[PDB]
Amino acid sequence: RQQLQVLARYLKMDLDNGERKFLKEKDTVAELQAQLDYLNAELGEFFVNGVATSFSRKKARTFDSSWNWAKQSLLSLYFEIIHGVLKNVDREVVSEAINIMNRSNDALIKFMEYHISNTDETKGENYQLVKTLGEQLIENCKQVLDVDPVYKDVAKPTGPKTAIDKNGNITYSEEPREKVRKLSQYVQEMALGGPITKESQMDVEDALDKDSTKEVASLPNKSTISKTVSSTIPRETIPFLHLRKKTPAGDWKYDRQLSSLFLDGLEKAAFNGVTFKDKYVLITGAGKGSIGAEVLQGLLQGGAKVVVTTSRFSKQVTDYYQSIYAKYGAKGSTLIVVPFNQGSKQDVEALIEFIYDTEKNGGLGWDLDAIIPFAAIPEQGIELEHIDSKSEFAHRIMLTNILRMMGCVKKQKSARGIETRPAQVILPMSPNHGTFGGDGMYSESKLSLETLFNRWHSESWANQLTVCGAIIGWTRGTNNIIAEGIEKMGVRTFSQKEMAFNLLGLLTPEVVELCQKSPVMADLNGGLQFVPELKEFTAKLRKELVETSEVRKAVSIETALEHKVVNGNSADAAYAQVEIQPRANIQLDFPELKPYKQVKQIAPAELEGLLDLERVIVVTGFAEVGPWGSARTRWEMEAFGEFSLEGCVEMAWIMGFISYHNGNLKGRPYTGWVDSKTKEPVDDKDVKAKYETSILEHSGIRLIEPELFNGYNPEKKEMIQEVIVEEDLEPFEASKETAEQFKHQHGDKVDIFEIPETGEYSVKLLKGATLYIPKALRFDRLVAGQIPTGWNAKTYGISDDIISQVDPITLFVLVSVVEAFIASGITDPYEMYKYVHVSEVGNCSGSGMGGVSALRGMFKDRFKDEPVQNDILQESFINTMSAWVNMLLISSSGPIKTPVGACATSVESVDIGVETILSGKARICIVGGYDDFQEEGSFEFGNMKATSNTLEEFEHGRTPAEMSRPATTTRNGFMEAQGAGIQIIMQADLALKMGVPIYGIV
Amino acid sequence: EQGIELEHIDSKSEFAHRIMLTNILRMMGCVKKQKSARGIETRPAQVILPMSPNHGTFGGDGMYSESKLSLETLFNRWHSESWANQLTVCGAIIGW
Amino acid sequence: GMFKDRFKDEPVQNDILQESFINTMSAWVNMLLISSSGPIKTPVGACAT
Amino acid sequence: ASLLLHVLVAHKLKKSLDSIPMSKTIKDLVGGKSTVQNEILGDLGKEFGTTPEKPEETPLEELAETFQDTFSGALGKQSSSLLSRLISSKMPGGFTITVARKYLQTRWGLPSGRQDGVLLVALSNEPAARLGSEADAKAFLDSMAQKYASIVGVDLLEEITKDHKVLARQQLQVLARYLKMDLDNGERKFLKEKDTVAELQAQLDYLNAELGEFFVN
Amino acid sequence: PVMADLNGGLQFVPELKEFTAKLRKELVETSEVRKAVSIETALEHKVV
Amino acid sequence: DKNESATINEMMKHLGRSEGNPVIGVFQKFLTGHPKGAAGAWMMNGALQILNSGIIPGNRNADNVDKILEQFEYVLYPSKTLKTDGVRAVSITSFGFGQKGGQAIVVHPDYLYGAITEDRYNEYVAKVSAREKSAYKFFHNGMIY
């Protein structure tokens, strides 16, 4: 230790400097950690955490293509009427008519024109309907071409209905209002008010739920009215919706004029609809199942250009909006979805900057005309003394940052001299400032907003913003149980479609200009204002309900036990029924054969015997091994998006979750599924609940699971680098054979010497020698379409010897050749040789590369002297897959032509197959393609810039399941996958004779 | 806060709003817990709320008008919640 | 170059994948000489292709 | 920007910078192979940062104009990777990018950015094998600094103690080994705290971003 | 809850913002013209 | 995606596809990824399943159809599944490295049975039925065991 010290001294090297520096950082850490600790002490978890950023420009999703969704929208209404999902009574055909008209092209017309004019009215009653409706629709679209798109809600108006069982079961429905059918009739209802609004501060028979086609013909016609709904308003009655005017005294009382302007607007909007063409709108709080999303649907229907904010930005949520756009996205509309946190100052600033910034600079290039800051957080059960971290944060989203947001767009406009294009701000106001129990700090946020009615005048943003305060009333949506009761007092509660219609009515040109003259205040509270002691009244209804439920259910549960006592529990036991629970009956799903009478109706009668059936190539079976299971489960997911019972049970089986068992299970006998890990029994009806959640997580296009690829880790890719040893390595022990292999390689640059006692040699690498030092590389491609996790050629029944001997790709191929024969009802391949000669069954399956795994063992695993088989050369060949198929299964002496077609070997294979049969060389042959996914494959595709960059996909908010999007605006490169798929093809004549299924004609 | 209009509201005004509203709430709430945790049901504390007659009447209050208008919810919270024996609200509209 | 020369971080082209394929020989033939849009069926027959 | 854009485009094409006229365009220098157009395009991004609007058409002298405005003495990300790769596989045992500059400066008098030119000219003329002698590597740096000389237009004992100190340093190491004492543990721990600091410092930075000075203070 | 108007009738003066502002302008102007005119009649004296 | 659309568009345009009747395109690579050599086969399966079910699945990852593609008036890009009253023929097309192009036309099976005698057709339905039963047999055996 001393010899060390003195040496260090001579060397002038400070041995303790590490610990010095370390101890100093350790200090500054508890220091920072301290301040952070305090800031958390003051703001609280919720605030500090909840205030993190969410918005980034790259995660924005824009929806454009109304031009395409319209053809779809219509081609869907069309099959739906034909299939009688929509009958001519359903209001849906009228709604969808409106949305189709909202997208008239010279092109959409030629679409309906072709499809409608080409329907055989004769075919059925349903077919006439589509054709008649179709023609009617075609007419209307011809008119609405070159005409502004319109927001018109046709949905059947509803009201609240609560009913308590005879057994205390409280149930809530939404029934159609007896005396209300059109939105038209709803405006009238509003203007009349009720008896509860005392002091002051037309029949147009609809073909509505009777004949949709008739109503649809009405749509294009502008309603003329002389009896303006305003004039229905009684003297000394305040309508259920009204505008207000500030008295010089300072109070906001009901103004009949303003309220007539507003109500008349609403009426005109019910009959003609309103357009929002050319209106640019920012709306926060428009998540699913909210007043927001109903307002959003409206805006889009009128052709608005809208930015929607979402807090929970997901695939699930992206998918919601694409759905919504493809349904309501009018001509000239555009939806932009961005992730956003109205709680972050930085997000507020970032958002409306991205909105104003020129497209070149990565922006939207817009200028807002409306802002609808409905974003919020639910505070409940928080009273005065409970107000804390949550409520303070909530108050920030619901007030302070709304101010900040208006302020932001003010600066933008102003910084651009935009003095003649105000943005209208629909303030979400409340009628109940701390009327009810523990709002938290909600009432405070909602009351603060009301200062803008004065700030508009007193400050200097009046040409940049206008304030439009909406006092939102009682609204039911996804505590409605008392809705029916509150209403029982001459007050109106509203559905979300109703409030949305109400809010949308403040965007009509008429009330917009009103705002521009001086701030507008709209009472959208259907008279609740008048019901006295609203808190206690409200609470009573709730108590009376809840009590009536609980006494009724408690009395019944006791009269029921009294029966089991007095009248025996064995007399009541033989009186319950037995439920039956479903089991999975996986089916091969052969094709349907119609009665011949109907068959001969399909093709021309001339066809009979015209064709040499020895030269009609037909597909007899098929199967696949792929990311989504087999042909069965995959088609299920592709066509339906979820698995059936047979779906899960098969997926759970292939993936290894459940294993069949028949024997005694801990005493009692069992026959059925068993969790293979636990060996406990599993019922079919439970497989979904128990496994699907995980089954789904581990199939399809997902993150690359290194377990499935000998450890390939895209994030940590192994490579060696060459280095020259600068000074003699320290000697290591080695065998004689091995030491000699070193000396053979290095010569002058290595010494090997026998250790006389052991017989073995020491190997000393001298200076100048060459060394390979391993290092790691982070790679861009993190996702692949992989066979479901737990797939195992062992479970399809493949011998361990084959498993070893063969390249993985051969396993895929083997399993599908089997599954494809099964699909063709050929259970023993040798049955072919009942019909055909050994020489006439062929194999034309092919690969792009395939054997990619044996290739590596040959080029890389050899290069490391790692143990690798003596015939990996065999298994690398593209055509030894077909060889093992023939050697294990088929035993044919037919043709064996093997295609390399790269990304298209699979179609080329069919060509080659078809031809081989048409030349007489084979009468049955196997066709298909196969390929694997391995480490070196994915890397070189990345080097060709061919595959999608996963780091970039993430940067854009893309989940793995979303990174393969063909024909999309944002398509970014392909997603790589693995697997095989083959089909069996045959002469039509042979197929018929053998009696196998016929799935199609190649 | 002065010379702060809508688009100027920032760090100062948010902090100011905290002193002039949120923490006043927190303070009433605090003495409520104390009294209550002691069964003090017959000795309310009177709270003289400093209210304003001019909610954003004048130029750039910053966020003053907002703080002073929020206070007015206590006139209802007194009834609707459950601190009525611990605090009473006395709103003074302070003049010029 | 794809399996070994990459593994050593030796300089190797970005599309050696192209040239490893059994059917890019026929592709260069068509791209340099023939210019056909005819059939392109490529056999792997091992010692008898 | 001329010498940097030239060495990089002559490298991705594997032909001397005489074979390449900056007169031509990237579309012509490729011929048709659009993989190599995609490579030259993405490489210049990591290098200069600012992508002009027609990289594939705007000619090389005319691209070096646009890039010169925004760049200064920056050896660049993509070029800095190429020079340390040329030094590692082609330079004899021990000959660093460190040693190769102390030679370019000692025996050929080259400052910071002038030896940056000699390394970029050696990157276009990179040996297809590793040089053997340290004298072969010295002779290589010689002719490379004179090809830089006529492309830019410019013309051209303590070591005894050094050998001993090496000895002592080793006597130290082996001793430490025997002692089983980790000489580097200080710096380990230190580097880890340094990390957690920018980490905390980061969150604090953000909270300040959101709340502002006045509020936080 | 009790609400006390300790605002000595200001409630009633209309357009209080602008009214307020006017008083201020009239004052400030009267001050600045009066002080600017005197500073010039004072220099005219030193000249003449 | 653009090339393929253009080329499919043109083969329809040249042959006289009625204006207003586009081909409905599926893009199954969205669900499965792209397994170089397996591609064509997987699509050949889905095509058979489409023929025999009358259901045309939807490109569920089509958030937004590339505006470029509007020009191809003979192509329709569905984002949702359409259950139709029948599909008559599908067109599997695929493109590989090295100018390896390929198309296949699959026609619905029931057109075959038109060219055969009734007695023969009936005889066939008999055999097929018996196979299905014996194959359902086989399949559940080999799954379980």
CATH number of the domain encompassing residue A724: 3.30.70.2490
CA–CA separation, A388 vs F94, rounded Å? 62
> The tokens of F95 are what?
């493109």
User: Which of C9, C23, C41 lies closest to A911 in CB terms?
Assistant: C41
**What is the residue type of A947?**
T
**Per this entry, what is the length of chain D?**
217
User: A838-859 b/e with 16+ CB inside 10 Å = b?
Assistant: eebbbbbbbbbbbbbbbbbbbb
- Classify residue B37 by burial, with Cβ atoms within 10 Å: 0-12, 13-18, 19+: exposed
Do D37 and D61 fall into the same domain?
yes
A784 bridge partner residues: A702
Which of A785, A781, A665 is closest to F31 using CA atoms?
A785
> The tokens of A489 are what?
């007092």
Taking the mean position of all CA atoms in its chain, how far away is CA A380? 31
User: Which of B59, B78, B94 lies closest to E6 in CB terms?
Assistant: B94
Residue F27 contacts A where some CB pair is shorter than 8 Å? yes
Query: Residue A957: what are its φ and ψ, rounded to 5°?
Result: 85, 30
Do A390 and A262 fall into the same domain?
yes
CA–CA separation, A334 vs A349, rounded Å? 22
CA–CA separation, D174 vs A950, rounded Å? 47
Do A197 and A68 fall into the same domain?
yes
Do A296 and A399 fall into the same domain?
yes
- E37 min Cα distance to partner chain B (Å): 31
Question: For residue B14, what is the nearest residue in chain D, using CA coordinates?
Answer: D215
Residue with tokens 């490109």: F59
Residue A974 contacts C where some CB pair is shorter than 8 Å? no
Q: With contact defined as beta carbons under 8 Å apart, do A210 and A249 qualify? A: no
Do A21 and A115 fall into the same domain?
no
- A328 min Cα distance to partner chain D (Å): 37
CA dihedral F64, F67, F72, F75 (to 10 degrees): 10
Q: With contact defined as beta carbons under 8 Å apart, do A991 and A998 qualify? A: yes
**3-state SS assignment for residue D214:** helix
Which of A274, A771, A177, A29 is closest to D93 using CA atoms?
A771
Query: Which residue of D11, D12, D35, D123 to mutate against C (max C Cβ within 10 Å)?
Result: D35
What's the number of CA atoms in the CB half-sphere (13 Å) around residue A990?
Answer: 28
End residue of a domain, out of D156, D183, D202: D156
- E28 min Cα distance to partner chain A (Å): 21
Structural domains in chain D (count): 2
Does residue D146 belong to any structural domain of this protein? yes
Question: For residue B25, what is the nearest residue in chain A, using CA coordinates?
Answer: A384
CA–CA separation, C25 vs C43, rounded Å? 12
Cβ contacts of A38 within 8 Å, gap of 6 or more: none
Q: Which residues from B are below 8 Å from A519, CB to CB?
A: none
**Domain range enclosing A756:** 713-779
Cβ contacts of A228 within 8 Å, gap of 6 or more: A260, A264, A267
Give the helix/strand (H/E) hosting F46: helix F39-51
**What is the residue type of D115?**
Q
CA–CA separation, F102 vs A900, rounded Å? 13
Residue with tokens 């007095």: A566
DSSP A157: P
- Classify residue A776 by burial, with Cβ atoms within 10 Å: 0-12, 13-18, 19+: exposed
Query: Which residue of F7, F10, F99, F103 to mutate against C (max C Cβ within 10 Å)?
Result: F99
Do A748 and A774 fall into the same domain?
yes
CA–CA separation, A525 vs A430, rounded Å? 9
- Classify residue A339 by burial, with Cβ atoms within 10 Å: 0-12, 13-18, 19+: buried
E-assigned strand segments in A932-978: none
Locate breaks in chain E with C to N over 2.5 A; list the residue preceding each: none
Which of D5, D34, D32 is closest to D17 using CA atoms?
D5
Question: Which chains neighbour F (Cβ–Cβ under 8 Å, 3 or more pairs)?
Answer: A, C
Question: Which chains neighbour B (Cβ–Cβ under 8 Å, 3 or more pairs)?
Answer: A, D, E
Do A38 and A133 fall into the same domain?
no
CA–CA separation, A883 vs A898, rounded Å? 10
CA–CA separation, A617 vs A924, rounded Å? 10
Do D137 and D184 fall into the same domain?
no
Do D77 and D172 fall into the same domain?
no
What positions of A carry a catalytic annotation? 903
Question: For residue F99, what is the nearest residue in chain C, using CA coordinates?
Answer: C27
Q: 3-state SS of chain A: helix, strand, coil percent to 5?
A: 45, 15, 40
**3-state SS assignment for residue D181:** coil
- C37 min Cα distance to partner chain A (Å): 14
- CB spacing of F64 vs A969 below 8 angstroms: yes
Q: Count CB neighbours of D182 within 10 A.
A: 10
- CB spacing of C23 vs F98 below 8 angstroms: yes
**3-state SS assignment for residue A451:** helix
Which of A705, A983, A974, A994 is closest to A835 using CA atoms?
A994
Do D96 and D164 fall into the same domain?
no
Q: Which residues from A are below 8 Å from E17, CB to CB?
A: 457-458
Cβ contacts of A840 within 8 Å, gap of 6 or more: A894, A921, A922, A923, A924
Q: Which residues from B are below 8 Å from E2, CB to CB?
A: 88-91
Do D133 and D163 fall into the same domain?
no
Cβ contacts of A668 within 8 Å, gap of 6 or more: none
- C30 min Cα distance to partner chain F (Å): 9
Q: With contact defined as beta carbons under 8 Å apart, do A985 and A914 qualify? A: yes
DSSP A118: T
Cβ contacts of B64 within 8 Å, gap of 6 or more: B1, B16, B20, B52
User: Which of A11, A725, A944 lies closest to D172 in CB terms?
Assistant: A11
DSSP states of F59-119 as a string? -TT-SSB-GGGGG-TTEE--SS-EE-S---EEEEEEEETTTEEEEEEEE-THHHHTTS-HH
A152 bridge partner residues: none
Q: With contact defined as beta carbons under 8 Å apart, do E31 and E37 qualify? A: no
DSSP A274: B
End residue of a domain, out of D156, D179, D198: D156
**Per this entry, what is the length of chain E?**
48
Q: Which residues from C are below 8 Å from D36, CB to CB?
A: 14
**What is the residue type of D72?**
S
Residue with tokens 């050994």: A838
Do A88 and A24 fall into the same domain?
no
CA–CA separation, A499 vs A993, rounded Å? 68
Q: With contact defined as beta carbons under 8 Å apart, do A729 and A748 qualify? A: no
CA–CA separation, A924 vs A817, rounded Å? 13
CA–CA separation, F45 vs A619, rounded Å? 10
Residue with tokens 């102007």: E29
To one decimal, the resolution in angstroms is 3.1
Which of A652, A655, A661, A646 is closest to A692 using CA atoms?
A652
Locate breaks in chain A with C to N over 2.5 A; list the residue preceding each: 201, 478
Do D101 and D197 fall into the same domain?
no
Do D137 and D194 fall into the same domain?
no
- D213 min Cα distance to partner chain B (Å): 7
Do D60 and D133 fall into the same domain?
yes
CA A888-A894-A896 angle, 5° bins: 80
B45-51, strands of its sheet edge to edge: B45-51, B87-94, E2-6
Q: Count CB neighbours of A163 within 10 A.
A: 11
- CB spacing of F97 vs C30 below 8 angstroms: no
**Domain range enclosing D172:** 157-212
Question: For residue A879, what is the nearest residue in chain C, using CA coordinates?
Answer: C44
- Classify residue A585 by burial, with Cβ atoms within 10 Å: 0-12, 13-18, 19+: exposed
Residue E11 contacts A where some CB pair is shorter than 8 Å? yes
CA–CA separation, A247 vs D142, rounded Å? 93
CA–CA separation, A1001 vs A602, rounded Å? 15
What's the number of CA atoms in the CB half-sphere (13 Å) around residue D39?
Answer: 19
CA–CA separation, F97 vs C15, rounded Å? 12
Q: With contact defined as beta carbons under 8 Å apart, do A812 and A630 qualify? A: no
Cβ contacts of A939 within 8 Å, gap of 6 or more: A717, A779, A781, C6
CA–CA separation, A293 vs A157, rounded Å? 18
> The tokens of A258 are what?
């303003």
Question: Which chains neighbour C (Cβ–Cβ under 8 Å, 3 or more pairs)?
Answer: A, D, F
Do A2 and A72 fall into the same domain?
no
Does residue D182 belong to any structural domain of this protein? yes
Q: How far is CA A635 from CA A455, A642, A929, D194, F127, in A?
A: 61, 10, 18, 54, 27
- CB spacing of C3 vs A855 below 8 angstroms: yes
- C33 min Cα distance to partner chain D (Å): 16
Do A220 and A82 fall into the same domain?
yes
> The tokens of A151 are what?
């927001």
- CB spacing of A71 vs F22 below 8 angstroms: yes
CA–CA separation, A56 vs A956, rounded Å? 9
- CB spacing of A345 vs D171 below 8 angstroms: no
- Classify residue F23 by burial, with Cβ atoms within 10 Å: 0-12, 13-18, 19+: middle
**3-state SS assignment for residue E26:** helix
Catalytic residue among C33, C44, C46, C47: C47
Q: Report A:776-835 residues touching F (Cβ under 8 A).
A: 784-785, 797, 822, 825, 827
User: A459-473 b/e with 16+ CB inside 10 Å = b?
Assistant: bbbbebbbbbbbbbb
Q: In CATH, what number is assigned to the domain containing residue D189?
A: 6.10.250.1930
CA–CA separation, A374 vs A353, rounded Å? 20
Strand A732-734 and strand A761-765: pairing?
Answer: antiparallel
Do D99 and D198 fall into the same domain?
no
Do A76 and A188 fall into the same domain?
yes
Q: 3-state SS of chain C: helix, strand, coil percent to 5?
A: 40, 0, 60
Residue E10 contacts B where some CB pair is shorter than 8 Å? yes
CA–CA separation, A992 vs F125, rounded Å? 9
DSSP states of A15-57 as a string? TTHHHHHHHHHHHHHHHHHHHHHHHHHHH-HHHHHHTS----G
Give one word for A30, left, alpha or beta, with left for phi > 0 and alpha for psi -120 to 50. alpha
**3-state SS assignment for residue A669:** strand
- Classify residue E47 by burial, with Cβ atoms within 10 Å: 0-12, 13-18, 19+: exposed
Which residues of B touch chain D, with CB atoms under 8 Å apart?
Answer: 10-12, 14-15, 18
Q: With contact defined as beta carbons under 8 Å apart, do B91 and B71 qualify? A: yes
What's the number of CA atoms in the CB half-sphere (13 Å) around residue D187?
Answer: 5
Give the helix/strand (H/E) hosting A465: strand A465-472
What positions of F carry a catalytic annotation? 34
Q: How far is CA F85 from CA A78, A82, A442, in A?
A: 10, 8, 54
Does residue D116 belong to any structural domain of this protein? yes
DSSP B88: E
Taking the mean position of all CA atoms in its chain, how far away is CA A554? 44
Residue A903 contacts F where some CB pair is shorter than 8 Å? yes
CA A823-A827-A830 angle, 5° bins: 125
**What is the residue type of A255?**
D
**Torsion sign over Cα A800, A804, A810, A812:** positive
End residue of a domain, out of D156, D182, D197: D156
CA–CA separation, B80 vs A435, rounded Å? 6
Q: In CATH, what number is assigned to the domain containing residue A33?
A: 6.10.250.1930
CA–CA separation, A772 vs A190, rounded Å? 85
Q: With contact defined as beta carbons under 8 Å apart, do F20 and A114 qualify? A: yes
Residue A406 contacts B where some CB pair is shorter than 8 Å? yes
DSSP states of D28-95 as a string? HHHTT-HHHHHHHHHHHHHHH----S-TTTS-HHHHHHHHHHH-SS---HHHHHHHHHHHHHHSPTT-
Strand F75-76 and strand F23-24: pairing?
Answer: parallel
Does residue D217 belong to any structural domain of this protein? no
Does residue D46 belong to any structural domain of this protein? yes
Question: Three-state SS across B11-66?
Answer: HHHHHHHHHHHHHHHHHHHHHHHHHHCCCCCCCCEEEEEEECCCCCCCCCECCHHH
Does residue D75 belong to any structural domain of this protein? yes
Give the helix/strand (H/E) hosting A939: helix A935-943
Q: Which residues from B are below 8 Å from D214, CB to CB?
A: 11-12, 15
User: Which of D88, D168, D210 lies closest to A346 in CB terms?
Assistant: D210
Do A81 and A24 fall into the same domain?
no
How many separate helices (H) and strands (E) can be counted in chain A? 37, 29
- B7 min Cα distance to partner chain D (Å): 16
CA–CA separation, F67 vs F64, rounded Å? 8
**What is the residue type of A813?**
V
- The radius of gyration of chain B from alpha carbons, rounded to an integer in Å, stands at 15
Q: How far is CA A663 from CA A648, A667, A681, F138, in A?
A: 24, 10, 12, 21
Do D183 and D107 fall into the same domain?
no
Do A25 and A80 fall into the same domain?
no
Q: With contact defined as beta carbons under 8 Å apart, do A843 and A915 qualify? A: no
A733 bridge partner residues: A762
Do D148 and D183 fall into the same domain?
no
> The tokens of A290 are what?
């909210």
CA–CA separation, A596 vs A608, rounded Å? 12
**Per this entry, what is the length of chain C?**
49
Q: Which residues from C are below 8 Å from D35, CB to CB?
A: 14-15
**What is the residue type of A143?**
Q
Q: With contact defined as beta carbons under 8 Å apart, do A238 and A491 qualify? A: no
CA–CA separation, A811 vs A445, rounded Å? 65
CA–CA separation, D67 vs D9, rounded Å? 14
Q: With contact defined as beta carbons under 8 Å apart, do D6 and D60 qualify? A: yes
A252-254, strands of its sheet edge to edge: A61-63, A334-339, A305-310, A280-284, A370-373, A423-429, A465-472, A520-524, A242-246, A252-254
Q: Which residues from A are below 8 Å from F143, CB to CB?
A: 586, 653, 660
- CB spacing of D39 vs C15 below 8 angstroms: no
Q: With contact defined as beta carbons under 8 Å apart, do A166 and A246 qualify? A: no
Q: In CATH, what number is assigned to the domain containing residue A98?
A: 3.40.50.720
Experimental method: X-ray
- CB spacing of B53 vs E8 below 8 angstroms: no
Residue F98 contacts C where some CB pair is shorter than 8 Å? yes
CA–CA separation, A627 vs A978, rounded Å? 7
Taking the mean position of all CA atoms in its chain, how far away is CA D117? 11
- CB spacing of E11 vs B91 below 8 angstroms: no
Cβ contacts of A655 within 8 Å, gap of 6 or more: A691, A695, A698, A699, A788, A789, A790, A791
Residue with tokens 């003699």: A728
Q: How far is CA A970 from CA A61, A544, A783, A952, in A?
A: 9, 57, 18, 12
Do D40 and D115 fall into the same domain?
yes
CA–CA separation, A416 vs A671, rounded Å? 77
CA–CA separation, A343 vs A401, rounded Å? 7
* Touching pair E, F by Cβ (3+ pairs < 8 Å): no
